[PDB]
């Protein structure tokens, strides 16, 4: 009933987050969903599809608008146990929360991939596994739930540090109080685009509300750069290493294009071209292609791209090498 206080607070904040996009809003979850209009709007926002509506302001209009939402969920094979339209239109607290949870679970939490997963892991289990992989390497017991494991605030800070090590000091997190750790995690996460669904004072308890924590943790996962399934991309564990690869690659090619462009200003001129140039060109290609995978991390703020490291800055010296290549081309041409 205190987790209900908190779950309601979280689910309200979560709902308002999405209604914001269409200029809708709720104050009391147990009242402002009863006519079916905001439930529908929420589903339209979340799903990207347009739903029908019953105009009218009798109770059966209310019941039908709720039913339109329930059917839409049932049709997408969502399981609605015990929830019926009159439960919603009449304000049933426990079933209103269950319905929001069902929506959250289906639209936000369920769309997660984790290399290391099975086909038969729940979303909850997959998300748990992500947190374990991300925070592997920080001091702490293993995370096996979405309640007590999160109450001291250290997990939150580790999640963030993995993605933005410059924004968190994990040493200090070891000896700060739970409240300080929680407060500063929510704060920083906000800067990185994570809406504050939780209040530090509600999580600093022995058993924080699981559905609230999952919703927030899942939301952090949404905000962070991700590698799509099987696709090409860079995880938070590979970034430092790829970023160094990249810079080193440039620090190798650029000055070869510069020291091998001066030779062109002053019969083997066919080997200095169908051999090396086809290789050095390929470097330029390997480079510009790697930069593409890095863009995400540059936009995310993890990498500050120093000047003279864009794939362009390479093309502008490769162009210069193409010119002086053409000068001494028409000359060794008789």
Residue numbers in the entry: 41 to 306, 321 to 388
Tell me, in the authors' exact words, what the paper reports:
Evolutionarily conserved in multicellular organisms, spectraplakin proteins such as ACF7 (Actin-Crosslinking Factor 7) can crosslink microtubules and F-actin56. ACF7 harbours an actin-binding domain (ABD) at its N terminus and a microtubule-binding domain at its C terminus. The ABD of ACF7 contains two consecutive CH (calponin homology) domains. ACF7 is a microtubule and F-actin crosslinker that is critically involved in regulation of cell/ECM adhesion dynamics.
To illuminate the potential mechanisms of how F-actin binding of ACF7-CH domains is regulated, we resolved crystal structure of ACF7-NT (containing the CH domains and a part of the plakin domain) at 2.6 Å resolution. ACF7-NT is folded into an elongated polypeptide that is ∼92.4-Å long and ∼58/14.3-Å wide with two tandem CH domains following the spectrin repeat 1 (SR1) of the plakin domain. The SR1 of ACF7’s plakin domain consists of three α-helices connected by short loops that pack in a left-handed helical bundle with a typical up–down–up topology, which is highly conserved among plakin family protein. ACF7’s ABD consists of only α-helices connected by short-loop sequences, and adopts a closed conformation with extensive intramolecular contacts between the two tandem CH domains. Previous biochemical and mutagenesis studies have revealed three major F-ABSs (ABS1–3) in the tandem CH domains, which are conserved in ACF7. However, in closed conformation of ACF7’s ABD, a number of key residues in the ABSs were buried within the protein and were unlikely to be involved in association with F-actin. Interestingly, tyrosine 259 is outside of the conserved ABSs and located at the C-terminal end of the last α-helix in the second CH2 domain. This residue is in close proximity with the hinge region of ABD in the closed conformation. Structural analysis demonstrated that tyrosine 259 forms hydrogen bonds with isoleucine 150 and tyrosine 151 in the hinge region of CH domains. In addition, the hinge region between CH1 and CH2 domain is stabilized by the hydrophobic interactions between isoleucine 150, isoleucine 152 and leucine 165, leucine 167 and tryptophan 168.
